[PDB]
Amino acid sequence: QVQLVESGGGLIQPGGSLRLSCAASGLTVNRNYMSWIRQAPGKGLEWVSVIYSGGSTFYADSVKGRFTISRDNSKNTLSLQMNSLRAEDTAIYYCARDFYEGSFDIWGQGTMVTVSSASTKGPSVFPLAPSSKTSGGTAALGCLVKDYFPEPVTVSWNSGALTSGVHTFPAVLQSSGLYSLSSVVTVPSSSLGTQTYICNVNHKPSNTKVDKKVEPKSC
Amino acid sequence: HTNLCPFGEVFNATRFASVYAWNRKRISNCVADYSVLYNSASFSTFKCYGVSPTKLNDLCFTNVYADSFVIRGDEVRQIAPGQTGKIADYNYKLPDDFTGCVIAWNSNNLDSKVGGNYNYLYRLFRKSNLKPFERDISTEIYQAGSTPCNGVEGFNCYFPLQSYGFQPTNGVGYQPYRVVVLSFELLHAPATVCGK
Amino acid sequence: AIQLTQSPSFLSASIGDRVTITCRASQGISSYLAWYQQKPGKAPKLLIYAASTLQSGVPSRFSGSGSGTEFTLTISSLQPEDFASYYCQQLNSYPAPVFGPGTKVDIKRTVAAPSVFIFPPSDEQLKSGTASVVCLLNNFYPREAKVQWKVDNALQSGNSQESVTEQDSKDSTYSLSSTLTLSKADYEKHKVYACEVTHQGLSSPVTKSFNRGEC
Ligand SMILES: *[C@@H]1O[C@H](CO[C@@H]2O[C@@H](C)[C@@H](O)[C@@H](O)[C@@H]2O)[C@@H](O[C@@H]2O[C@H](CO)[C@@H](O)[C@H](O)[C@H]2NC(C)=O)[C@H](O)[C@H]1NC(C)=O
Ligand SMILES: [Cl-]
């Protein structure tokens, strides 16, 4: 039953503070090299901080003076106090045990930290209309889900009755700080005049549900 | 006193200790020529605390201790007052009020061997930090969890020492460095170690 | 400080293949290396440490080797749960741990050229002051693909973002979107909007285009 469990992550504004905690069972925190490691979206691992059994602490240059690692012997927990947070601190934060010169054998599941000044906002949904130009072939159509915050949104088609050929892309973070994604589907060109296609968009943080009919555009 | 202090035996010693089992030479009743050490162009590190290195030949002390051992290049910075890290915390610790000198030089040509020199060891695991000038030579399996180990290396049960494994192709930070720590002790007793 | 490179960045393999991944250190680091596996949405999993010691509970098909500057991770017979990313780590490093940039091992299949589609911005979005132009690359393999936006034959850079799906569980293909963002005023200063796609499955680049205002 060896495990680490992180908690305390969430959404915060730049300059704000968060405190992460990590509950250990199957190992004693104050007898181990215990570290926090983080992973920004789409990026690789970055070690953040360590506390030695004897009490020494060390920090990555990018967090020095802002983060503080600590531990609670009575609760067998590890903590990370994060002050003066910045957008680039956005990452999944892992606690891990170092058993040989940085070899991390036990990892927690991670807790997500999102630092942003963006206002919560529901997406606009725009059609990606099927082109007017292959007879007897396949047509592509979709929905552009633009300018929302925070993650996530979900997309279905025809309230779940259309699943074959659907591709809902991972969101991208725009320079505005808002997310955007698209969902596409390929269908028979023959069906464009007769079968209705509706994308169902759900953004729970803003209580937004949008249905968008996607039709061939007319002149 | 006219006999020279046997500093040659320390600095020019055939073999050096592992840092966890650091050697101590107690030097007394002799004349020391410290300027010979500082005039040498063969030391990478020569840092003194509480004493000026040059104006050291006209001082008398009760006892001079010469501690010697091998560490990594990247770890020499830990042999200094007020430092923390694997070596300072668990292998060799200087006091905050240290009076003495720390001398180091690259020994890659002597202490690395092809395929790895596993003679030199350091302590990786220890519950608490060492006190200044404490030497821990124990080899008890280190207990990292709640269940006892009793001599077997397994989960949460680690042999406390690890090998540097110095290979001659190592980056400089991983290469071996010989270290000599001279500490100067002035007690209310006859001063046996003077310079000239 | 020491830097780690990894080779190759992407590798396609089939069930049962012998797979070897390489990690290079810019200076000699003896056997101070570890290997991890990571899958999307999951924490890393330690595979090898001290360059060659197999972590307990890891299948014996995993092995590591090398000393000094050149290190390899070998999977003797690739199993379905081994499709993942793999990272090396420099151990006992000063001042901080260093991780290699990774190798992603995906599922090999026959080459499949993408089907390419371009979508103009909707009239509804245009009335808001922004134009999103979308290029879709559907069901292609391998993953490597190039999208080049052209506006009145001027090659666009700096104003597009792309997104790619994970490898499809049924046909092992990828799909990709590229989105070009312009202000309405800029969009209305030009006529021909095109995305040119380069991919191994295409004998020469495929271009899809539309003229603004022409249905
Ligand atoms: C440690 O030894 C060096 C070098 O020793 C030389 O070689 C030995 C085998 C032995 O024969 C020594 O007597 C040799 O001198 C000492 O530095 C040397 O000093 C002499 C003059 O006293 C000089 O001629 C040499 O060139 C020096 N060697 C080098 C390499 O510069 C050094 O003094 C000894 N250390 C201590 C603390 O006494
Ligand atoms: Cl113990």
Side-chain angles (χ1 to χ4, degrees), chain A, chain B residues 1-195, chain C:
Chain A
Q1 262 138 324
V2 188
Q3 66 176 20
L4 307 166
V5 179
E6 303 91 340
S7 65
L11 175 64
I12 197 68
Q13 292 171 107
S17 296
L18 290 172
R19 186 182 183 93
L20 309 180
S21 185
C22 166
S25 53
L27 60 94
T28 315
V29 164
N30 76 350
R31 313 188 58 81
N32 281 277
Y33 294 103
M34 298 299 303
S35 277
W36 291 93
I37 305 105
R38 71 183 177 182
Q39 185 165 217
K43 263 83 167 64
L45 300 167
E46 182 187 25
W47 169 85
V48 178
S49 181
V50 69
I51 179 161
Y52 288 14
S53 66
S56 291
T57 60
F58 303 96
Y59 299 87
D61 199 70
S62 63
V63 306
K64 187 178 176 180
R66 298 188 300 124
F67 294 8
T68 303
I69 193 174
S70 62
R71 68 192 175 197
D72 189 333
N73 311 274
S74 57
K75 281 140 188 170
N76 199 30
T77 57
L78 178 77
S79 288
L80 189 65
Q81 179 67 42
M82 307 177 294
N83 300 327
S84 302
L85 280 160
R86 309 154 178 177
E88 61 270 21
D89 297 313
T90 295
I92 291 177
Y93 283 70
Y94 302 100
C95 59
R97 188 270 294 278
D98 168 0
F99 85 94
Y100 174 68
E101 296 295 354
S103 302
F104 302 113
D105 61 332
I106 286 93
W107 294 72
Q109 89 285 340
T111 183
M112 184 64 194
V113 171
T114 305
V115 184
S116 174
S117 62
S119 295
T120 292
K121 178 189 172 295
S124 286
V125 183
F126 302 116
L128 299 165
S131 162
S132 61
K133 298 168 198 166
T134 42
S135 285
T138 301
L141 56 98
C143 278
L144 171 62
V145 185
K146 190 169 164 54
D147 292 343
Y148 67 89
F149 186 89
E151 289 269 55
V153 311
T154 58
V155 184
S156 62
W157 284 90
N158 294 348
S159 301
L162 181 57
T163 58
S164 163
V166 173
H167 293 299
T168 298
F169 290 94
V172 301
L173 178 61
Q174 309 166 109
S175 61
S176 64
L178 305 181
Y179 295 92
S180 166
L181 65 75
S182 71
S183 179
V184 304
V185 62
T186 54
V187 302
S189 289
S190 65
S191 77
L192 288 181
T194 58
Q195 176 66 51
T196 66
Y197 295 106
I198 303 171
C199 71
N200 322 106
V201 179
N202 193 29
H203 182 247
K204 293 217 225 159
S206 66
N207 299 290
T208 296
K209 303 199 63 177
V210 171
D211 299 321
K212 194 56 166 223
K213 190 172 187 146
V214 183
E215 304 167 341
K217 192 184 184 186
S218 60
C219 181
Chain B
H1 283 109
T2 63
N3 54 340
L4 285 76
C5 299
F7 284 123
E9 294 183 359
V10 179
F11 286 88
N12 284 331
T14 311
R15 315 177 275 156
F16 267 54
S18 289
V19 61
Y20 87 93
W22 47 274
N23 253 122
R24 165 158 288 188
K25 174 79 171 175
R26 187 178 189 270
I27 287 165
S28 65
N29 308 285
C30 58
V31 173
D33 186 354
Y34 293 108
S35 280
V36 154
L37 286 183
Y38 205 17
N39 271 78
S40 177
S42 50
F43 296 131
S44 312
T45 301
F46 204 129
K47 297 190 181 185
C48 298
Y49 308 81
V51 288
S52 130
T54 63
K55 299 189 177 182
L56 183 60
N57 253 335
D58 37 23
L59 289 183
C60 294
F61 291 99
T62 310
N63 292 310
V64 181
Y65 300 95
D67 303 330
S68 58
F69 51 83
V70 164
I71 52 176
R72 271 176 58 165
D74 284 330
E75 299 168 340
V76 170
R77 65 189 86 254
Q78 293 184 45
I79 314 303
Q83 300 301 298
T84 57
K86 196 200 313 160
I87 301 306
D89 298 355
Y90 307 137
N91 289 265
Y92 183 87
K93 178 58 173 183
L94 289 176
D96 290 349
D97 65 353
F98 174 60
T99 298
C101 303
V102 174
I103 306 161
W105 61 100
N106 187 291
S107 56
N108 195 42
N109 60 329
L110 309 173
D111 289 325
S112 74
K113 95 163 192 167
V114 198
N117 177 13
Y118 303 96
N119 286 321
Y120 288 103
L121 307 173
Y122 61 94
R123 185 171 304 278
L124 176 60
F125 291 105
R126 195 179 202 266
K127 180 56 200 77
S128 312
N129 299 348
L130 292 171
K131 299 181 172 187
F133 301 121
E134 188 171 16
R135 182 176 173 259
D136 187 354
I137 54 180
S138 85
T139 51
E140 297 303 299
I141 302 306
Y142 182 77
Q143 187 178 328
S146 59
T147 82
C149 301
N150 53 232
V152 186
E153 299 177 20
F155 188 71
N156 287 344
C157 286
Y158 311 136
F159 194 75
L161 305 180
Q162 294 293 332
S163 174
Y164 278 109
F166 295 122
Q167 302 176 16
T169 60
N170 277 352
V172 170
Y174 286 90
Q175 291 183 13
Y177 278 67
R178 289 181 176 196
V179 180
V180 180
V181 180
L182 304 178
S183 60
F184 306 100
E185 198 191 37
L186 177 70
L187 312 176
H188 301 260
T192 72
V193 189
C194 295
Chain C
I2 304 198
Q3 322 179 65
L4 293 179
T5 63
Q6 246 177 283
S7 231
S9 298
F10 296 92
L11 166 78
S12 290
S14 301
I15 301 297
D17 286 355
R18 181 181 186 90
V19 166
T20 75
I21 296 173
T22 295
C23 181
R24 253 92 156 203
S26 59
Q27 309 165 33
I29 62 174
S30 280
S31 296
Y32 287 116
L33 201 86
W35 288 99
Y36 301 82
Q37 179 191 77
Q38 188 177 219
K39 301 187 191 174
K42 295 287 178 267
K45 186 175 166 209
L46 175 74
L47 302 169
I48 304 281
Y49 61 99
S52 63
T53 303
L54 184 67
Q55 163 73 349
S56 61
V58 177
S60 47
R61 63 183 178 269
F62 287 93
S63 65
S65 61
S67 212
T69 55
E70 305 254 333
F71 307 85
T72 68
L73 176 71
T74 294
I75 302 174
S76 56
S77 185
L78 194 78
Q79 292 302 306
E81 47 272 315
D82 298 344
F83 296 107
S85 289
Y86 294 88
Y87 301 95
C88 56
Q89 177 190 349
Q90 179 202 353
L91 301 177
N92 198 1
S93 64
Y94 178 81
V98 177
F99 295 95
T103 292
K104 179 173 150 60
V105 179
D106 75 338
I107 305 172
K108 179 147 75 150
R109 59 149 291 158
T110 60
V111 176
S115 311
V116 187
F117 306 88
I118 189 167
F119 299 101
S122 66
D123 286 351
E124 194 196 355
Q125 184 189 26
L126 272 187
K127 85 178 179 175
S128 71
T130 300
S132 303
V133 198
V134 175
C135 188
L136 166 68
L137 285 60
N138 208 42
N139 293 6
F140 61 90
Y141 183 89
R143 154 89 165 279
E144 300 77 31
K146 176 190 202 146
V147 182
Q148 175 66 76
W149 285 101
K150 295 183 194 176
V151 181
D152 284 340
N153 274 339
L155 280 65
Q156 298 298 295
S157 98
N159 50 3
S160 53
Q161 300 184 273
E162 57 184 43
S163 185
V164 64
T165 61
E166 285 299 290
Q167 196 171 20
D168 187 79
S169 61
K170 281 222 260 189
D171 65 17
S172 301
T173 68
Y174 300 90
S175 293
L176 180 147
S177 70
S178 180
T179 300
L180 177 75
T181 300
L182 300 187
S183 75
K184 173 190 196 255
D186 278 5
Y187 175 71
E188 292 176 342
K189 292 199 287 195
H190 302 115
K191 180 182 175 180
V192 186
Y193 288 85
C195 60
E196 177 188 61
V197 172
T198 303
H199 186 270
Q200 179 182 348
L202 304 167
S203 60
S204 64
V206 166
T207 301
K208 299 296 171 180
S209 65
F210 66 87
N211 300 330
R212 176 182 55 77
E214 300 179 13
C215 73

